[PDB]
Curated annotation (Swiss-Prot), chains A, B:
Effect ascribed to mutating D83S: Destabilization of dimer and loss of zinc binding
Residues binding Cu cation, per UniProt: H46, H48, H63, H120
This protein's name: Superoxide dismutase [Cu-Zn]
Disease: Amyotrophic lateral sclerosis 1: A neurodegenerative disorder affecting upper motor neurons in the brain and lower motor neurons in the brain stem and spinal cord, resulting in fatal paralysis. Sensory abnormalities are absent. The pathologic hallmarks of the disease include pallor of the corticospinal tract due to loss of motor neurons, presence of ubiquitin-positive inclusions within surviving motor neurons, and deposition of pathologic aggregates. The etiology of amyotrophic lateral sclerosis is likely to be multifactorial, involving both genetic and environmental factors.
Outcome, altering A4V: In ALS1; severe form; reduces structural stability and enzyme activity; increases tendency to form fibrillar aggregates
Recorded catalytic activity of this chain's protein: 2 superoxide + 2 H(+) = H2O2 + O2
Sites bearing N-acetylalanine, chain numbering: A1
Organism placement in taxonomy: Eukaryota, Metazoa, Chordata, Craniata, Vertebrata
Other facts noted in the record for this chain: The protein (both wild-type and ALS1 variants) has a tendency to form fibrillar aggregates in the absence of the intramolecular disulfide bond or of bound zinc ions. These aggregates may have cytotoxic effects. Zinc binding promotes dimerization and stabilizes the native form.
GO molecular function: copper ion binding; identical protein binding; protein homodimerization activity; protein phosphatase 2B binding; protein-folding chaperone binding; small GTPase binding; superoxide dismutase activity; zinc ion binding
Source species: Homo sapiens
Function: Destroys radicals which are normally produced within the cells and which are toxic to biological systems.
Note describing how the cofactor binds: Binds 1 copper ion per subunit. Binds 1 zinc ion per subunit.
Record's keyword terms, sorted: Acetylation, Amyotrophic lateral sclerosis, Antioxidant, Copper, Cytoplasm, Disease variant, Disulfide bond, Lipoprotein, Metal-binding, Neurodegeneration, Nucleus, Oxidoreductase, Palmitate, Phosphoprotein, Ubl conjugation, Zinc
Record note on quaternary structure: Homodimer; non-disulfide-linked. Homodimerization may take place via the ditryptophan cross-link at Trp-32. Heterodimer with SOD1. The heterodimer CCS:SOD1 interacts with SLC31A1; this heterotrimer is Cu(1+)-mediated and its maintenance is regulated through SOD1 activation. Interacts with DAOA; the interaction is direct.
Length: 153, 153
């Protein structure tokens, strides 16, 4: 029933399109698409609380974390709602995404419609990097590309 | 209060930032901001049903019309939910937007959050254009700039 999409865009080579689908409001959200222009390896993949309020915004903005948990991996009970972990780019810089998440939703309090999907500069350390910043952002670094999550055809 | 924001982006010089605010969930939505890079005169200003599912999309898709009405002006009872009429650009090509609307909402089943705000090539004829396309789109023409309506800080 509920379907959504984010077009990932930035001031750079990184671009992609990520689809969200959730057949029942109690069910998982299937997340699939691909991102190109990435450096080989892992890149943080997070939902941030707000849409851009400026042209050519560089900041990622706060993580989507309505329950005020510490940053973790998507498998962890202790995590932000928006903690979707890492996408993996191949040697050509293409990252094909195919995950399922039961913490994000496309409806209700934890709805990510109207929020921002961001692929990050560096790998998300999943809260296990051993410093204060690890429990906030996973040390994923800067926003390479982002898109507001919108309703999809 | 519910707040939203759309960053209107295009290929040409047309760009803008439009804010939405709704003090009461059954009250009017305040729409304000500014658009620049426009030709002097009236430009169609509509909420469309879907967010882009492609990079560099040139088409504004279907109008957001969940109640299946005919196209009209914002003051008409016969209108789409997304029929916000026209904005007016001065001789410097800048349109100061200051609207209030009681058909659109930022919440509920027919919330515009996650939909696309689009500024169009030419004036909306408000359904009074004298052909079939008039009662569908108001003949406002191509999309000049667009943005997904996201949640605002």
């Amino acid at each position: 029933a509920t379907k959504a999409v984010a077009v990932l865009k930035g001031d750079g080579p990184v671009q992609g399109i990520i689809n969200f689908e959730q057949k029942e409001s109690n069910g998982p959200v299937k997340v699939w698409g691909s991102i190109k222009g990435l450096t080989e390896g892992l890149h943080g993949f997070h939902v941030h609380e707000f849409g851009d309020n400026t042209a050519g915004a560089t900041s990622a903005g706060p993580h989507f974390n309505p329950l005020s948990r510490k940053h973790g991996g998507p498998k962890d009970e202790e995590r932000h709602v928006g903690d979707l972990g890492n996408v993996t780019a191949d040697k050509d810089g293409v990252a094909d995404v195919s995950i399922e998440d039961s913490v994000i939703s496309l409806s209700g309090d934890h709805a990510i419609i109207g929020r921002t999907l961001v692929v990050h500069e560096k790998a998300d350390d999943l809260g296990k990097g051993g410093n204060e910043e690890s429990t906030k952002t996973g040390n994923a670094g800067s926003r390479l590309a982002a898109g507001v999550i919108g309703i999809a055809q």
